[PDB]
Amino acid sequence: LEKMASIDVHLRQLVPGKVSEDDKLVEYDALLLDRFLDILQDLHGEDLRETVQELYEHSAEYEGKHEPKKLEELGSVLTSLDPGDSIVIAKAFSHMLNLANLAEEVQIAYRRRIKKLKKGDFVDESSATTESDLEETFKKLVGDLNKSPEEIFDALKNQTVDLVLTAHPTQSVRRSLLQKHGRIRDCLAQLYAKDITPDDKQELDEALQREIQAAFRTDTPPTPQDEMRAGMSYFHETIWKGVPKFLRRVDTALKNIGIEERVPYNAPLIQFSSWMGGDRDGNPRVTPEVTRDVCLLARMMAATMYFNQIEDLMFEMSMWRCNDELRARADEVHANSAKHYIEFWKSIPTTEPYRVILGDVRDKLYHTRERAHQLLSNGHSDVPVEATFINLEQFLEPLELCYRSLCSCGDRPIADGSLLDFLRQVSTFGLSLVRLDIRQESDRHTDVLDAITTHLDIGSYREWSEERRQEWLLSELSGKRPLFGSDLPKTEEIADVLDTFHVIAELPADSFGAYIISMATAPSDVLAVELLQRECRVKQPLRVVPLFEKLADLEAAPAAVARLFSVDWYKNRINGKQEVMIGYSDSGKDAGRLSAAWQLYKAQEELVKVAKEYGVKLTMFHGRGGTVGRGGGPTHLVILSQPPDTINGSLRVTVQGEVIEQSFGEEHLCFRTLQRFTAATLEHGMRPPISPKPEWRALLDEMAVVATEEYRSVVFQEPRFVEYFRLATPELEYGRMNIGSRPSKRKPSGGIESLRAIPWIFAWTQTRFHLPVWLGFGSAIRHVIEKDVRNLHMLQDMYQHWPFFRVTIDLIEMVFAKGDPGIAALYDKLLVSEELWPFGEKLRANFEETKKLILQTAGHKDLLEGDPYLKQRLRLRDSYITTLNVCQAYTLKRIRDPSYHVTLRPHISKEGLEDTLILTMKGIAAGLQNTG
């Protein structure tokens, strides 16, 4: 059984050097692959294992030298498989790739940092191995920026990082498999403890095989409640315990620069928001009942976690010396009816006052859970609302009383233990863990107000000009008469909108965040949501957040927001705070990526100018994809790259589902995520990036013109482009496939304009081509190099000295690292008409030229020259991904073309090609993670 020696040789040939000396990635992945292949031999036979290992070896040789002969060598094997063998092989490479990710995570979490590797500039913030931790950021602020420790502390006090969980564009990984990945990571890490005993190591090996098999032997498009349940798992996994540890580390770093206070436990440095069950944009499956469900489910998970956390808190709080105030409350609580701690104590006596009060809190938490459960499964309760906590103050008040009393009695250290962590958990997570944003297209609000005005015999709000719409909406917001009643013809859509508002109205305000308007263009959209909110009797209306998607919408955004701030009603409703959302993926679908990047920098600049004008605190909400959508260290520089004063201590970022596991799956990875978001926000508030030189802005304006020209000329002007897109890519199968929880085309008939951003990026990411990400950069850089000899030098200056530019270029280079034109050529050869075959050749030439020009700008000879660790990990995944690519291509040809008969091979073991296609989609998706 000498197969391990060969896979060892191929892994060492794929990743030759050591990116450090704790570089155990090759060792880790070799171990996981040996154990997996032994299990595979045991379950589906020797023949299956030999076939699989032959496929992987060819894949590694290809990712070695990129010989096109290797790809046909893979294909000859993969097409001769009957659907059963195809499914077993595809499943196998999916789990192998997953194991590579798990090993990769262990490497990242236990890679020792290097102090001597820091260069001293902003480039260090692009990798976790050199980025500034919390305290290095403090000493950067104190030494270089001449900020006082008091100023840093006060900034932290008023800072908020708000992380928004969004639905996975594909497989939102089930909670059970998250747990299994956790056990696998734990077993790996412990197996490499330089102190492990022989028996412990054997039992760890046996647990590792056991877990790999457990994950490999498990097989609707999950209901939005199920996907939400799955998306919330990271709170149980790492975030709940991780948050108080991080805040405590903030306290320590403050003590180490002379600050004697701790960060106030009620200061919302960390907040969590969710779109799961709230985003309705082109998703009729997200109903009012779905939103109510995920709201109550969230309140349930929160009550459970607080309930379970408060018993160990009750065990710790056994003191007797206390406040006069606390003693009064304890004697008060002692006057009542003790069912949830009989296993611990028959009853809580009055000489343990903290235990009395805390026991009453535990009882109210129990009634809170049971009521939320009763509302969820029925629609009414009988549990008195006064016997529960309804707002955060009812909850915080007795805990704060305990804290005051303990400090009163010289027991402050005890208070800074389980109690401080608990208080910080209540402040971070509230009664819901997350606050749900609601998202809907503006057009639906136009439809509702149009049915309303037509019903009042005043005309059609839709035909009205923007100014007339604003004037009517303003006259209604300032009036006292209601707008409509039950007597109102509602279409299914109009009734959905109003019913969603009624459900928001009947639920606690702690569950909701922002009302997000998709395709927002004008102030009347924002006023429409505010009016519909008020007239549906929502007592505390949500803050309305416009989403400006298209490029023209971005240009018109600061005028519309200034006009909104200028009207007295909206100015008194917002009370000096406004949140605006900009969409990177969406805008890229409109006008290419380079143009969306520069337009979003300028648009944020102008929005900040308006916000300073009217005295409003602006919060920029960064949607999905983009430069702000990356994993790990790059994000630190991403945040540092935003224009000066666009953050100002209030950051709101989408954590894309395709990165959320790499970011919160493990204890260390999670802690470092929270650390870098907080540190980059704090530093940016006190140390903005440089203002761009005037020639830099002129150069980017021209490049923006050329890049949007090329992008629209290929994507939108070419007549046969849509046919090519439907052939050289699995877009049709992705939409038909019940994969994306929502549908792809907003209007089923329409073109790419109506195609959503997620399938737009996905379709080209599956083929390792990524055209929506890089297209346009080529002609823009060619144009400026040819127009003036010196512009290359200017470009190289920007990449070296302008953070915004460096992060934009860095993203293009990274996406090219995940690209391989040869595989794309295979897709062309199998799936595209001969009439249309030369077209892909031209686009591929553009791919190569764009790659060379990006290298020239970054001063690099190879891709990712500055981040060898990431190059290593990506090169590792590519060996598995390439196999899922070839399998997906031939499977597509077999699905579309029943006239393509293959010489099948005999069944292998196990002692429908649609399923295999879905496997390859999920696999390739999991191996490429984030692109644009």
- 3-class DSSP string for 591-615: HCHHHHHHHHHHHHHHHHHHHHHHC
In terms of CB distance, is 365 or 757 closer to Cl ion?
757
Q: Which does 482 bind (CB under 5 to 8 A by kind): Cl ion, a second copy, none?
A: a second copy
Provide the token pair at 178: 């998250």
To the nearest 10 degrees (0 to 180), the angle between helices 353-377 and 288-316 is 160
Minimum separation from the CB atom of position 475 to a second copy (A): 12
Minimum separation from the CB atom of position 265 to a second copy (A): 38
- Asked if 209 and 275 touch (Cβ cutoff 8 Å), the reply is no
How far apart CA 80 and CA 67 sit, in angstroms, is 22
Provide the binding-site residues for Cl ion, judged by CB under 5 A. Answer: 757-758
Minimum separation from the CB atom of position 531 to a second copy (A): 14
AA identity, residue 880: Y
Q: Which does 483 bind (CB under 5 to 8 A by kind): Cl ion, a second copy, none?
A: a second copy
Q: Which does 480 bind (CB under 5 to 8 A by kind): Cl ion, a second copy, none?
A: a second copy
Q: Which does 380 bind (CB under 5 to 8 A by kind): Cl ion, a second copy, none?
A: none
Spatial CB neighbours of 636, under 8 Å, sequence gap ≥ 6: 125, 126, 131, 132, 676, 679, 680
In terms of CB distance, is 459 or 482 closer to a second copy?
482
Beta bridge partners of 515: 438, 544
In terms of CB distance, is 495 or 556 closer to a second copy?
495
How far apart CA 127 and CA 672 sit, in angstroms, is 12
* Catalytic residue from among 58, 168, 364, 622: 168
Minimum separation from the CB atom of position 169 to Cl ion (A): 8
Give residues after which the chain gaps, C-N over 2.5 angstroms.
219, 337, 911
Minimum separation from the CB atom of position 484 to a second copy (A): 7
> Pattern 227-256, binding to a second copy, x per CB under 8 A?
------------------------------
Burial class (CB in 10 A: 0-12, 13-18, 19+), 722: middle
Q: Considering Cα of 371, then 374, then 379, then 383, what sign does the dihedral take?
A: negative
Strand, helix or coil for residue 650: strand
Minimum separation from the CB atom of position 221 to a second copy (A): 41
Q: Which does 457 bind (CB under 5 to 8 A by kind): Cl ion, a second copy, none?
A: a second copy
Minimum separation from the CB atom of position 478 to a second copy (A): 11
Minimum separation from the CB atom of position 624 to Cl ion (A): 6
Spatial CB neighbours of 692, under 8 Å, sequence gap ≥ 6: 700, 802, 804
In terms of CB distance, is 36 or 762 closer to Cl ion?
762
**Residue whose C-alpha is closest to residue 837's, from 828, 849, 850:** 828
In terms of CB distance, is 456 or 559 closer to a second copy?
456
> Pattern 324-353, binding to a second copy, x per CB under 8 A?
------------------------------
Q: Which does 410 bind (CB under 5 to 8 A by kind): a second copy, Cl ion, none?
A: none
> Pattern 430-459, binding to a second copy, x per CB under 8 A?
-------------------------xxx--
In terms of CB distance, is 406 or 758 closer to Cl ion?
758
In terms of CB distance, is 482 or 912 closer to a second copy?
482
Q: Which does 319 bind (CB under 5 to 8 A by kind): Cl ion, a second copy, none?
A: none
- Asked if 391 and 350 touch (Cβ cutoff 8 Å), the reply is no
Minimum separation from the CB atom of position 649 to Cl ion (A): 27
Active site residue 168: yes
Q: Which does 904 bind (CB under 5 to 8 A by kind): a second copy, Cl ion, none?
A: none
To the nearest 10 degrees (0 to 180), the angle between helices 224-231 and 288-316 is 30
**Residue whose C-alpha is closest to residue 180's, from 89, 245, 95, 87:** 95
In terms of CB distance, is 324 or 487 closer to a second copy?
487
In terms of CB distance, is 472 or 769 closer to a second copy?
472
In terms of CB distance, is 481 or 901 closer to a second copy?
481
482 Rama class: left (phi>0) / alpha (psi -120 to 50) / beta: beta
In terms of CB distance, is 457 or 786 closer to a second copy?
457
- Number of helical H runs and strand E runs in the chain: 40, 8
Q: Which does 116 bind (CB under 5 to 8 A by kind): a second copy, Cl ion, none?
A: none
Provide the token pair at 78: 């993969």
In terms of CB distance, is 483 or 567 closer to a second copy?
483
Q: Residues 876 to 915: which contact a second copy by CB under 8 A? A: none
- Asked if 879 and 63 touch (Cβ cutoff 8 Å), the reply is yes
How far apart CA 322 and CA 320 sit, in angstroms, is 6
Minimum separation from the CB atom of position 758 to Cl ion (A): 5
Minimum separation from the CB atom of position 456 to a second copy (A): 6
* Catalytic residue from among 58, 180, 364, 589: 589
Minimum separation from the CB atom of position 129 to Cl ion (A): 32
Q: Which does 481 bind (CB under 5 to 8 A by kind): Cl ion, a second copy, none?
A: a second copy
How far apart CA 520 and CA 531 sit, in angstroms, is 16
DSSP secondary structure, 386-439, as one string: GGS--SHHHHHHHHHHHHHHHHHTT-HHHIIIIIHHHHHHHHHHTTTSSEEEEE
Q: Residues 454 to 513: which contact a second copy by CB under 8 A? A: 455-457, 480-485, 487
DSSP secondary structure, 424-455, as one string: HHHHHHTTTSSEEEEEEEHHHHHHHHHHHHHH
Spatial CB neighbours of 785, under 8 Å, sequence gap ≥ 6: 791, 792, 795, 853
Q: What are phi and psi of 576, to 5 degrees?
A: 75, 20
Minimum separation from the CB atom of position 488 to a second copy (A): 8
Q: Which does 16 bind (CB under 5 to 8 A by kind): a second copy, Cl ion, none?
A: none
Strand, helix or coil for residue 274: strand
Q: Which does 757 bind (CB under 5 to 8 A by kind): Cl ion, a second copy, none?
A: Cl ion
Q: Which does 790 bind (CB under 5 to 8 A by kind): Cl ion, a second copy, none?
A: none
Locate the DSSP E strands across 474-539: 512-518
**Residue whose C-alpha is closest to residue 578's, from 646, 678, 656:** 646
In terms of CB distance, is 481 or 861 closer to a second copy?
481
DSSP secondary structure, 740-797, as one string: SSS-SBSSSS--TTTB-HHHHHHHHHHTT--HHHHTTHHHHHHHHHHH-TTHHHHHHH
How far apart CA 706 and CA 710 sit, in angstroms, is 6
At which residue do the structure tokens 């007295």 appear? 568
Residues annotated as part of the active site = 168, 589
* Residues engaged in binding a second copy (CB under 8 A): 455-457, 480-485, 487
